Amino acid sequence: LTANSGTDNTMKITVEGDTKLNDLLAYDSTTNTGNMQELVKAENAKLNVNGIDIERQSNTVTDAPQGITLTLTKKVTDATVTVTKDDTKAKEAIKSWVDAYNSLVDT
Amino acid sequence: RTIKIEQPGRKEPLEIKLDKGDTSMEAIRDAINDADSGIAASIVKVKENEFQLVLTANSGTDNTMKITVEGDTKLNDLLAYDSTTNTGNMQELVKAENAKLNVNGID
Amino acid sequence: ASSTTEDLKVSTTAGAAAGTYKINVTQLAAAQSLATKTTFATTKEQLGDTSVTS
Amino acid sequence: IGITQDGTSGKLKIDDDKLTKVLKDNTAAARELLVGDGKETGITTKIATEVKSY
């Protein structure tokens, strides 16, 4: 029973009334002890940036980065990413823009 | 805003003439881009709900960064920083360090 | 821009600046999972009774 | 930038190397040249307004 991931989104599921599901769904994830077995216990993401360690849970973050999305499949060590400015897309856009004028003059 | 950034490497100091009504953070980035300033803002992700600033054009004792403010209500105290002291309000990823290699049997 | 490492990838959208940065990850991201104890010998029988309307 | 019209006609005899070297020199000049403020100033805004009038 996995709606999403994260300790921030705590999921509390109950049953108002059911023939068999009433007892089945009674459990509290906060206590971490109950009738239902656990496959993966509550674990949080861990990293070290700015010389500071962070244990906060959230995996994907896009607010602070402000223009980069990080996709991870395996563990990495001290990965260095160098960002380089691209200007060829402006070049092609300018070339299409000048072409529009050349076509207009030809017409 | 009055910010003067100087290094021994470049003879001409860097100074900006940001005008009234253009004091937003993105406005500051646009002004930096328009000025073609050597100082660059790199993407540093800590976590959500945190705002951060970086000001690193280069590194090394030859290129020391002297940052001053003529007069500002808030920025004069914010921009006070000395690289030589190695202790201040200005956080760092790694201490003052440069590239290191070995050629011709010499480091 | 693109990253040198292949295990982890980055995707840059417009409006971002250019600059190098080194990142370290100590523990791989872990997703919380909750399992339900529905151990019944035969699940072919109707889980809910027909008396309950919903 | 290097956008040059033809000697006898309106075709833009664009100088590819000149345009390329200028845009690698600085894109900010291009940003501030024709876009301007982006709200009302700019070639696109007036062209669109006059076409909507037409």
Curated annotation (Swiss-Prot), chain C:
Full-protein interval shown: 75 to 128 of 467
Name listed for the protein in its UniProt record: Flagellar hook-associated protein 2
Quaternary structure (record): Homopentamer.
Family: Belongs to the FliD family.
Purpose of the protein: Required for the morphogenesis and for the elongation of the flagellar filament by facilitating polymerization of the flagellin monomers at the tip of growing filament. Forms a capping structure, which prevents flagellin subunits (transported through the central channel of the flagellum) from leaking out without polymerization at the distal end.
Location in the cell: Secreted; Bacterial flagellum
